[model samples]
Target: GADDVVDSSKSFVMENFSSYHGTKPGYVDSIQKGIQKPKSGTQGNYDDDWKGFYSTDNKYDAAGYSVDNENPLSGKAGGVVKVTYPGLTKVLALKVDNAETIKKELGLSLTEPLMEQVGTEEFIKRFGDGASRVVLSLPFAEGSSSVEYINNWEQAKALSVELEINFETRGKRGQDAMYEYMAQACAGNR
Candidate 1:
C-alpha cells in the first residue's frame, strides 16, 4: 500500500506546484511527444508520459496530502495559513510538534519564515475551494511520468538521505540538488 497510484489531476501539489523544473505548467501531454505504451488500453492519463521515483512519510488525510490539526500554526490563528506542497505546509498540516523545528529539519528557511499566509477567516472566504490556488507554489517534479505521492513528509525526507543532503543544503543548494535530481533523473531527462 506504500506504492499507491495517485491521479495528478487530483493532487494538490500537481494543481498548485507552479512550474515543473523551470518549465511551463509541468506534465507531458501525450506519448507522441515521447512515449511507448505497454498496455492494450492505450492509457493516456495525467503524468502518464513522465518518469519519477520519490518517497514520502506523513500521516496525511485520506487524500494523501496533509492531515488537519486543531492548531492553526504558531498560535497565529485568525491569520491565513498558506498551504504549500512538500514544504512548510507539510509541517503545519501534519502531526509534528514544533513548526520551526520540523521546518528546519525539512530544510525550510527561517530567514524567509513563511508565506501562503492569510487570515484564517479571510482564507476561508477566499480559498473557499481552490480559489487561491494561484497564490501557493512550490518546486515539484515527477518520475516515470507518474508521481511518488506517498504523502508522507517523513518519508519524503528520505530524499535528503538518498542525496546525502545536509540540513544546510536542504534549505538552498541541497534543495536545488534534489530538484535537479528530479529533473535530470526523475523526469526522464536522462
Candidate 2:
C-alpha cells in the first residue's frame, strides 16, 4: 500500500520536473561545485565571539539556509522526499513550494557552488556517474485535507467509493491515513 502511493508520487514528480516551480537549477552541479571547493570551519565558531555557545540556553548559533530568514512566515518545518530513477541517471535535482506568491526563484551561482549545503560530493559523485535521485523539500504539515484531498476526492471517491486529516495522537508511519487513502482507492471502508 505504502509502496504504491510512494511510487506514484515519485513517478508523478520526475515525469514532470519541468512543471515544478520555486526550485533551484542544476542541483547536481551546485552540489558538485560546492564539494570540489569545500568550505573551511575556520570561519570562526561564534562561541568565541558569543562565549560558551553550547553551554547556555540563552545563547544560540545563527544557522539554517539564508533563504529561510527571507521568509515572512516563521516557524516552518522541512521535509525530504527522494526519488531514485533507474540506471546511472545522474539527474539529481531539488524543488520547493516556498509559498503562494514567491514562485520565481533564482538558482545559486556557480562560483558560490551549492556543494555540501545541498549534498555531499561523494553522494552526488556516486550517483553522477546512474540511478540518480531527485531530492525534494516541502512542508511536513500538509495543509487542510478538506481542501486538497477532499475537494479532489469527496465525490471523486463517491464515484468509486474517501479522506482526513487532523492532529493529536497522530502516530508515526501514519498507517491510519495511509490505509484510509488506499481503502478509498480500493473501494469501501475508511
Candidate 3:
C-alpha cells in the first residue's frame, strides 16, 4: 500500500509538472573548441583548452540563448522527500515541519533563513538519535518559504551535507497549479 501510494504520488508529479515548463530561464555555456573530439589521437590538456577560449563582448538577445530547465523534483508536491547522498547507496529520508522550530534548532541565521544543511553532531544534539537520519523540512507561509536538512550520522565526518531549494511564487497559472498539487500531496500523506 505504501509503495502504491508513492507510485501514485510520483505519477501525479510527472503528469502535472509537464505543463509548467518555461516559467523561469537561467543561463549556462560550454566551451565549443580546444577540447579533443571523441576518439581523437591527440591528448587534451587544460592549457590547450585555455588557449583556444575567447572572450566575446558581443551582446546577444536573451531569447536567442539556449535554455536547459531541468528540475527532477520540479512539480514536487510535498510528501515524504528522500535524498541519496553523493557516494552512498542508501537514500536518507526528509521530514517537513514548522520553519521557526527548524531554524532555532539548526542554528540558522535569523534574518533571511530559507534553508540550511547541518552536520551530524549538531543534528543529533538537537533532534536526538532516532531522528538522526538525513531529514529535510520546508515551511512556507503567505510570503515566505524556508527549508532545512540534517545529515546522516553514519556518513563520513569529513563530508558536509549538500542541499538546496528554490522557492519562487510568481502568481502564474502554473504556479497556482503546483501549489494545489503540493497541498493535495501533503494532505494525502496525512
Candidate 4:
C-alpha cells in the first residue's frame, strides 16, 4: 500500500510556483535592464531577491490572501476563528469542545474566559493587526478528516483543515497525556 503512494510529492512542489507577487518597480526594471530573463517560467536564473520565498510552515503561509492585502472574510457568509500565541510555547488549534475539555482536564486557570461572542470581522481585524498568524481551519466548518501537511507555500491554503491541541511535553513524568490529548482532540473534531 505504501508503494502505491506517490513518493514524488516533494519534487512536484519544486516544479510549481505556489504564490507570486508583483515586481517592485526598481527591482523588476533593474533585472530587465541588466540581466537575462528566463526562456519561460524558469526560476533558476533569477536573482535571490527576485525569487519568491516558499514556507512549509502552514500558519506562516496559510490564509490565501495576506490579511494585509485582502480580507476574505469581508462581506462573506462564513465565520472566522482567531487563536493567539503569546510565547515561544508550542501552539495548537482545536475545536471548541476539545479546547474546553483540555482546559478542564489540565485544571488550568483561565486568565480570561474565551468569549464566544467574538465575530469573524473582529477575527480578521485581529489577524490584520498581526496579533498572531491566523490559521484558517476547514475541519471546524466542513467536518473533514485529513492531516494538513504544509509542504510549501501553496499548501498553506489547506491549513484551514488542521486543528490541534497543544501542550508541553518537556520534563514530564507520565505517558504522553499531552500528545494523547492532542490526538483525541483531532479525532474528536472529525
> How far is each candidate from the true structure, as Cα RMSD in Å?
21.0, 20.1, 18.1, 22.9
Worst ten-residue run, lDDT, model 4? Answer: 75-84
lDDT tens per residue, model 1, 96-135: 3233543354444444322322213343233324332212
The better candidate by TM-score, 1 or 2, is 2
Off by over 4 Å in 4: 1-89, 93-100, 114-190
Using TM-score as the yardstick, the better of models 1 and 3 is 3
TM-score for each of the candidates: 0.17, 0.19, 0.22, 0.19
Which candidate leads in TM-score? 3
Worst 10 residues of 1 by lDDT: 18-27
| lDDT (C-alpha, whole model) for all candidates | 0.24, 0.22, 0.26, 0.25
TM-score for candidate 3 = 0.22
Pull out the clashing pairs in model 3: none
Off by over 4 Å in 3: 1-101, 105-117, 139-190
Candidate 1 Cα RMSD (Å): 21.0
TM-score order, best first, reads 3, 4, 2, 1
- Candidate 2 lDDT score at position 50: 13
Residue 93 deviation, candidate 1, in Å? 19
Indicate the worst ten consecutive residues by lDDT in candidate 3: 13-22
Q: Per-residue lDDT for 1-190 in model 4, tens only?
A: 1112212222221112222212211233332232223345633213321121222233212222122113322321111122222321111232332323333433323332222211124432432233222222112124434322211122122322212211112213112333343355446644
